[PDB]
């Protein structure tokens, strides 16, 4: 469950942006191959910077955060 504008890594060895922390732009709830759309700053062999990945192919790699309670 990532958020619109979070930082998760890509687990798609086939994707040019594998092992990279892309940012989530939005999710498409309807029925496609990758509900979550991930943006990228780098490009691939062709020249793109916006692909689609599934929430299962994204890990949350955020830094430490303070939570409620002690």
Short mmCIF file of C-alpha atoms in Angstrom, two decimals:
data_model
loop_
_atom_site.label_atom_id
_atom_site.label_comp_id
_atom_site.label_asym_id
_atom_site.label_seq_id
_atom_site.Cartn_x
_atom_site.Cartn_y
_atom_site.Cartn_z
CA UNK A 1 0.00 0.00 0.00
CA UNK A 2 2.13 2.94 -1.24
CA UNK A 3 0.96 6.58 -1.29
CA UNK A 4 0.70 9.11 -4.15
CA UNK A 5 4.28 10.48 -4.07
CA UNK A 6 6.04 7.86 -1.91
CA UNK A 7 9.52 6.35 -2.41
CA UNK A 8 9.59 2.58 -3.13
CA UNK A 9 12.24 0.45 -4.88
CA UNK A 10 11.48 -1.48 -8.10
CA UNK A 11 11.56 -5.31 -8.01
CA UNK A 12 11.36 -5.73 -11.82
CA UNK A 13 14.74 -7.07 -13.06
CA UNK A 14 13.26 -6.79 -16.58
CA UNK A 15 12.60 -3.05 -16.09
CA UNK A 16 15.52 -0.71 -16.93
CA UNK A 17 14.87 1.03 -13.58
CA UNK A 18 15.39 -2.13 -11.47
CA UNK A 19 16.87 -1.65 -7.96
CA UNK A 20 15.83 2.04 -8.06
CA UNK A 21 13.63 4.06 -5.65
CA UNK A 22 11.08 5.59 -8.07
CA UNK A 23 8.21 7.84 -6.90
CA UNK A 24 4.51 6.89 -7.11
CA UNK A 25 2.38 9.37 -9.12
CA UNK A 26 -1.07 7.72 -8.93
CA UNK A 27 -2.87 4.34 -8.91
CA UNK A 28 -5.37 3.08 -11.53
CA UNK A 29 -8.04 0.88 -9.89
CA UNK A 30 -9.76 -0.80 -12.87
CA UNK A 31 -7.87 -3.87 -14.17
CA UNK A 32 -4.44 -3.46 -15.83
CA UNK A 33 -0.97 -5.07 -15.59
CA UNK A 34 0.39 -2.46 -13.12
CA UNK A 35 -2.14 -0.57 -10.94
CA UNK A 36 0.53 1.77 -9.51
CA UNK A 37 2.35 4.19 -11.87
CA UNK A 38 5.99 4.92 -10.95
CA UNK A 39 7.88 7.99 -12.27
CA UNK A 40 11.66 7.95 -12.89
CA UNK A 41 14.35 10.66 -13.20
CA UNK A 42 16.70 8.50 -15.33
CA UNK A 43 15.74 6.99 -18.71
CA UNK A 44 16.26 3.65 -20.51
CA UNK A 45 18.02 2.62 -23.76
CA UNK A 46 15.20 4.34 -25.70
CA UNK A 47 14.22 7.50 -23.77
CA UNK A 48 11.31 7.18 -21.30
CA UNK A 49 10.67 8.32 -17.70
CA UNK A 50 7.17 7.05 -16.79
CA UNK A 51 6.26 3.34 -16.53
CA UNK A 52 3.71 1.32 -14.51
CA UNK A 53 4.45 -1.20 -11.72
CA UNK A 54 2.28 -3.27 -9.34
CA UNK A 55 2.24 -2.66 -5.55
CA UNK A 56 3.70 -6.18 -5.16
CA UNK A 57 6.75 -5.08 -7.21
CA UNK A 58 7.49 -2.10 -4.90
CA UNK A 59 9.16 -2.11 -1.46
CA UNK A 60 8.97 0.88 0.93
CA UNK A 61 12.53 2.18 1.49
CA UNK A 62 11.78 5.31 3.57
CA UNK A 63 14.09 6.49 6.39
CA UNK A 64 13.38 6.15 10.14
CA UNK A 65 10.14 7.86 11.29
CA UNK A 66 8.64 8.68 14.72
CA UNK A 67 5.31 6.93 15.45
CA UNK A 68 2.61 7.77 18.04
CA UNK A 69 2.97 6.50 21.66
CA UNK A 70 6.47 5.81 23.07
#
